[PDB]
Amino acid sequence: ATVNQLVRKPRARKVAKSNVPALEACPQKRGVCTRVYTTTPKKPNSALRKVCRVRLTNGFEVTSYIGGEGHNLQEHSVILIRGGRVKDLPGVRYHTVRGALDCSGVKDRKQARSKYGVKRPKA
Amino acid sequence: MVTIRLARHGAKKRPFYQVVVADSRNARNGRFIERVGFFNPIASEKEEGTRLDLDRIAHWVGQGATISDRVAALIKEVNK
Amino acid sequence: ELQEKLIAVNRVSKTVKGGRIFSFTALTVVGDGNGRVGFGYGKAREVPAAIQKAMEKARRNMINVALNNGTLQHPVKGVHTGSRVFMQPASEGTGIIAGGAMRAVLEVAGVHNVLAKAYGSTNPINVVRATIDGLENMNSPEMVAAKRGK
Amino acid sequence: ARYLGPKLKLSRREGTDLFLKSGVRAIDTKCKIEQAPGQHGARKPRLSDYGVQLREKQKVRRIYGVLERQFRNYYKEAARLKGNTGENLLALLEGRLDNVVYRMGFGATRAEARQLVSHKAIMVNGRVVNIASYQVSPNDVVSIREKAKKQSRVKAALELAEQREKPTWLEVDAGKMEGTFKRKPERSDLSADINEHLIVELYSK
């Protein structure tokens, strides 16, 4: 490449583009929720996984994961969505938080006090 | 027209009591022409806690610069 | 206080015929602790034997360095099969620092005050031979000036 | 990091005397002393060629009761002072205010000698002090405020100072509660169960 081929434009830089574009750079996004479904995970492993359908307050509608066990997740309950790639589900990149809005905490919890939507009772 | 003022010249409650040559148009914490010394009564327990430049002062007092009540007792002491 | 140092260990597993076999390779250094460096390759069906073969070669290998006062005077490069190890004299702090396969090599040469990176292949049996090509490449000043007549 | 638990349990984990929970009733008998920690463990772990120095370094750090950034401060100070870095690192920790308050006998433990500094009970050059990061000057006086002289804390610490090996580099009195840091210890003055001169090959980074 001659100096005559490097004229009027600096060398290009690229990629690092969102794999979670429906969040529009926000770390946690608000959405209404309409239905929950059970589906087949990756690998011959006989396990099952849960997913929900969530329209966001910016007009995108995503397929989101449900972690842990048990739910109160229903039509127009309103919940918060984040990123978080799943190795056990094809195309699943969106995840639900229990620590916000109508979403329920996990029952019988003795581990990790800040996770899965739990808060220890106080006076 | 030229004048001389005393300023706190420092951070929150940590003044240095600096004296500057400036113009009558300037603001309380605004512009100034020359920094000429400091007139601090505490000076963090310093023995040379007050000072004035004896060449820069003669360029403006001798010469029409007005001096505030806040530093005149020092300019009188070096007799400039 | 001569010290015999290990760089890395590798395991190579091969299907035969029916079933599998596996051997281990080690890379060690001994040198002299000042102005001389030396390294050995060793391969066996067990790690302690691969290290034992490597030490038996490392004590029978030597390279002389143009070294004075335990330190470098100029930046230097050395190359081997995609490892492009570049060395700079390091001062006013910690002496090691540098790439993980270089730290014992500099110390058995007595020059463990140097910042070095691989700038290519990170494979330790290429990296050590590119670091040693740099210790072979460096010269004294003294000799880079003494090339003048008289 | 805060341990939030028994001082003897911590001292057994580190396998050595830290000058913690000290008192004239002494160590030896009914206190698990010199026993290995937990259900299984060695009285000297076998360790890597860096780990053997790193484990001695964290004993030097805890036996003088300093933070990692403060241990590194004296390492960087000794790395620009004369020969062996480790003997000079120890001569900087041994000359620090909180350990001098311990060697003078005003606290029963190094942790209590340091508590007396944070609690503003100590004086140096006749002047009140609060920061444990201070290097004591040769032939200067260390004392305590008269408002603190009737604490059993100091009576029982000076009672213990009468029941240990005499520090050969200073002088102090329990009726005045006042002592002079004449010099640092030199060569045959000082020893410990842990090593200093071999850990001169650390950091990383």
């Binding site: - | - | 100029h74 072979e136 490449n137 000799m143 000036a145 003494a146 090339k147 003048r148 | -």
Partner: protein, 129 residues
């Protein structure tokens, strides 16, 4: 032509160390015999001479000294082409000051050491280290 006689000088010596040859021959020019005296002055060559008038030819006697090789890189700076000038106070240094930059100055072709000691600036043509 031969549209750059300086690349004819530079390659013929760089390729000569790569063949471990005792001397090399090239067509002569006034820059080639100036650069040859700087290379003889810093000890990168042993001697140089010219022979003939109809086709004057330059013979360079090579020097390799103790150990292996006498130079790592011999690099172009000014070109026939884009020419790079510096003042006496703006002269670069090569290889922690153990390498040379070649400068044509106002006086003649010399080292950056000789130039900053003579208080001169000019066109920088080569780096040798």
């Amino acid at each position: 032509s031969m549209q750059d006689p300086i690349a004819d000088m530079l390659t013929r010596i760089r390729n000569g160390q790569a063949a471990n040859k005792a001397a090399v021959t090239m067509p002569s020019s006034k820059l080639k015999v100036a650069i040859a005296n700087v290379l003889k002055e810093e000890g990168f060559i042993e001697d140089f001479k010219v022979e003939g008038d109809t086709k004057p030819e330059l013979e360079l006697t090579l020097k390799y000294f103790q150990g292996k090789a006498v130079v790592e890189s011999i690099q172009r700076v000014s070109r026939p082409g884009l020419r790079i000038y510096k003042r006496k106070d703006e002269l670069p240094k090569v290889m922690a000051g153990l390498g040379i930059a070649v400068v044509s100055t106002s006086k003649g072709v010399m080292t950056d050491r000789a130039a900053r000691q003579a208080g001169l600036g000019g066109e920088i043509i080569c780096y040798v280290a």
